[PDB]
Amino acid sequence: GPLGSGRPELYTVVQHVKHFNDVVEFGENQEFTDDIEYLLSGLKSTQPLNTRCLSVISLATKCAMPSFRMHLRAHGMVAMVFKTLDDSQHHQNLSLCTAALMYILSRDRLNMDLDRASLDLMIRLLELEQLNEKDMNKIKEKIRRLCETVHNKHLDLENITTGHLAMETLLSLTSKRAGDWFKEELRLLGGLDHIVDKVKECVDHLSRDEDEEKLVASLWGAERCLRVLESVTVHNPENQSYLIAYKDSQLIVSSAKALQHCEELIQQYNRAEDSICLADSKPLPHQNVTNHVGKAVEDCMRAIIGVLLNLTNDNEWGSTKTGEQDGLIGTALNCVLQVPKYLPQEQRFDIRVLGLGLLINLVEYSARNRHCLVNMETSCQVHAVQALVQLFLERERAAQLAESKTDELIKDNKALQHAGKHMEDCIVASYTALLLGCLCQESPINVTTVREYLPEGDFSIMTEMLKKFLSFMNLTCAVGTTGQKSISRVIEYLEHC
Numbered sequence: 001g002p003l004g005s006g007r008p009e010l011y012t013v014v015q016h017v018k019h020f021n022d023v024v025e026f027g028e029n030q031e032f033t034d035d036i037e038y039l040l041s042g043l044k045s046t047q048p049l050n051t052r053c054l055s056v057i058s059l060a061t062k063c064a065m066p067s068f069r070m071h072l073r074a075h076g077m078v079a080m081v082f083k084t085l086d087d088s089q090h091h092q093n094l095s096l097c098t099a100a101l102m103y104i105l106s107r108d109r110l111n112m113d114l115d116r117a118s119l120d121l122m123i124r125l126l127e128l129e130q131l132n133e134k135d136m137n138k139i140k141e142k143i144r145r146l147c148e149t150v151h152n153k154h155l156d157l158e159n160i161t162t163g164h165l166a167m168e169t170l171l172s173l174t175s176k177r178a179g180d181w182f183k184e185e186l187r188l189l190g191g192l193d194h195i196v197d198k199v200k201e202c203v204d205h206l207s208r209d210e211d212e213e214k215l216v217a218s219l220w221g222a223e224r225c226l227r228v229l230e231s232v233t234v235h236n237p238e239n240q241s242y243l244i245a246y247k248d249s250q251l252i253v254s255s256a257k258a259l260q261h262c263e264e265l266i267q268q269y270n271r272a273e274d275s276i277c278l279a280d281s282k283p284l285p286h287q288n289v290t291n292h293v294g295k296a297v298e299d300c301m302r303a304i305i306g307v308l309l310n311l312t313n314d315n316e317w318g319s320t321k322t323g324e325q326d327g328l329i330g331t332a333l334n335c336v337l338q339v340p341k342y343l344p345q346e347q348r349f350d351i352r353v354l355g356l357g358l359l360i361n362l363v364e365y366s367a368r369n370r371h372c373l374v375n376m377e378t379s380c381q382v383h384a385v386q387a388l389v390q391l392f393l394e395r396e397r398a399a400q401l402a403e404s405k406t407d408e409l410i411k412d413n414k415a416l417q418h419a420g421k422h423m424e425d426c427i428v429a430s431y432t433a434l435l436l437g438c439l440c441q442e443s444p445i446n447v448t449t450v451r452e453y454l455p456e457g458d459f460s461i462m463t464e465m466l467k468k469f470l471s472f473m474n475l476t477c478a479v480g481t482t483g484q485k486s487i488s489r490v491i492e493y494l495e496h497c
Contacts, residue, residue: 024067032071035062040077043084049091050132056085056097057139063104064150073113078105082118089124092162093136099125099165100143104150106172111181114173116189119182123191126166126224127198129217163224170228183232187242192232195225196243196251203254206261215265216293219300222258226303233310240311244318252311252318255304256325262301263331263339269294270342298343298351305335305354312361323362323369330376332358337378337387349424356431363438370442374449385439385446389453392432396465399425430469433462437490440497447497459497466491 016022039062041047042055059081062068072078081101088098102122105113140160147153151172155164173182186192202221210218229251233239243251270277271285271294283290311318323329335355340348362369376384402422409415439446451457470487473479479487 022066024070029067029071032068033075036072036075036077040081040084043081045084045087049094052085053094053097053139056094056101057142060097060101060104060146061142063101064146069105069108072105073108073110076113078110078113079115079118082114082121086117086121088121089128092128092130093132095125095128095162096143096160096165097139099162099169100146100160103165103169103172104146106169106178107150109178109181110173111179114182116185119185119189119191122166122169123186123194125162126170126228127194128162128166129221163220167224167227171231174228174231180236183236183239186232187239192229192239192242193246195228196246196254199225199229199258200250200254203258203261206258206265212289212293216296219262219293219296223296223300223303226255226300226307230303230306230310233307237315240313240315240318243307244311244315244321249321251307252322253325255308256322256328256331259301259304259308259335260327260331262297262304263334265297266294266301266339266342269297271295271344272342273344275341294343298347301335301339302350302354305332305358308358309354309361312358316365319362319364319366319369323366323372329359329362329369329372330378332362333373333376333378333384333387337380337391349428352428353431356428356435360431360435360438363435363442367442370439374439374446385436385449386453388432388436389450392429392436392462393455395425395429395432396461399429426465427469427472429465430472433465434469434487434490437462437466437494441490441493451497459494463491463494466494 039055039059043052085098088095140157143160144155147155199222202218205218269290312322332355336352340351373384378387399422402418406415406418436450
């Protein structure tokens with residue numbers, strides 16, 4: 001039962017005490033009961049705003065002390081502290097302080113301490129959108145140092161904002177460390193409804209034409225929220241299901257549109273270093289504007305696909321509903337074949353894997369997604385399978401050469417990079433082979449096609465690659481038995497082609 005404990009639970013408790021980190025006192029240090037009633041009064045609406053902000057920071061500063069937090073929570077003051085701050089959303093300065101306070105507090109498990117109201121507050125602070133500067137920076141710097149100390153989290157001062165700290169709070173509340181309590185509560189009490197609605201607002205603003213500031217705010221507004229939605233769906237089928245159902249699949253509908261806008265926007269803000277943009281209208285690759293918007297577009301993309309992966313991984317209504325969105329399957333394919341050439345070299349690996357992974361999810365069981373993909377057409381115009389075989393072969397060479405360059409250096413650390421690029425080109429070739437193999441085993445017709453565009457019609461170039469890939473996967477330990485087994489089966493199948 002709930003009172004019962006296994007060895008792991010007790011081992012943690014005992015290890016937590018013996019080798020410290022938490023140097024705590026259970027004793028009613030009444031100095032706390034003093035400090036605390038003095039601070040609580042500084043938080044009230046009846047107080048000038050700057051006095052409140054400083055009272056919050058001072059309270060957050062004391063909360064870097066595990067013993068203080070413990071006494072704050074043991075007296076049941078947390079819900080009360082945040083009730084007093086429940087008007088924070090109406091003031092941007094106090095909103096930053098309030099978000100910072102709960103982030104620090106969320107180092108611990110707040111199952112018993114946060115109430116619905118305080119949870120709704122933090123969601124409001126996450127939805128928030130936008131004179132006393134030189135000591136707001138001193139406050140921001142103070143917050144940054146607290147974040148490092150309490151969470152081992154290093155943030156740039158440019159990221160000590162309300163949107164960031166509210167996001168980090170919601171990620172911290174729904175991490176592995178936190179458990180599942182708040183993943184559950186965010187759903188059951190309407191929290192996820194509001195985060196999705198916010199994603200829709202932001203994504204609808206990309207569809208219009210807007211200036212740098214408004215564009216970055218739209219994108220960052222979506223990402224911020226998408227990352228919380230990604231978090232709450234990790235190992236949580238309920239939340240995946242809820243987000244697929246909510247408002248006629250609003251999240252997926254908005255996500256698909258967003259991904260498409262992003263595909264277009266990213267061309268507009270090229271940061272590729274091996275590129276030469278013709279247009280004088282397009283920002284140069286080294287401008288502040290370009291690395292500010294372009295990075296914002298990329299980050300939003302990674303967030304969109306992350307959510308879509310979680311919704312389509314095991315859930316087939318998710319895959320069905322996601323595949324039905326006009327142009328998504330096409331956009332996903334473009335994320336692999338086209339988008340990367342408008343990104344810094346370092347970022348191309350991640351996007352290719354994500355796009356390929358999403359395609360695999362969509363195509364695994366959905367016949368109609370399968371059909372839509374094989375009949376798709378793309379650039380280098382050609383059919384999808386043909387393009388995917390090309391990507392494989394292209395990347396399979398890029399790899400065996402990138403290893404030659406680094407096999408030369410070891411004898412005759414530019415090799416490190418060349419080795420890193422070797423691995424990357426292999427994994428991309430691998431996922432491409434895995435996708436093609438998937439399409440093949442679901443229909444022999446596709447086998448004929450891949451054979452046509454395969455040198456000699458010899459599938460061994462794919463199967464040999466997948467064997468090494470499966471072996472590499474078990475080095476990462478990222479995939480479990482079923483995953484490993486089904487990859488093996490794909491190798492078997494292709495081996496008989």
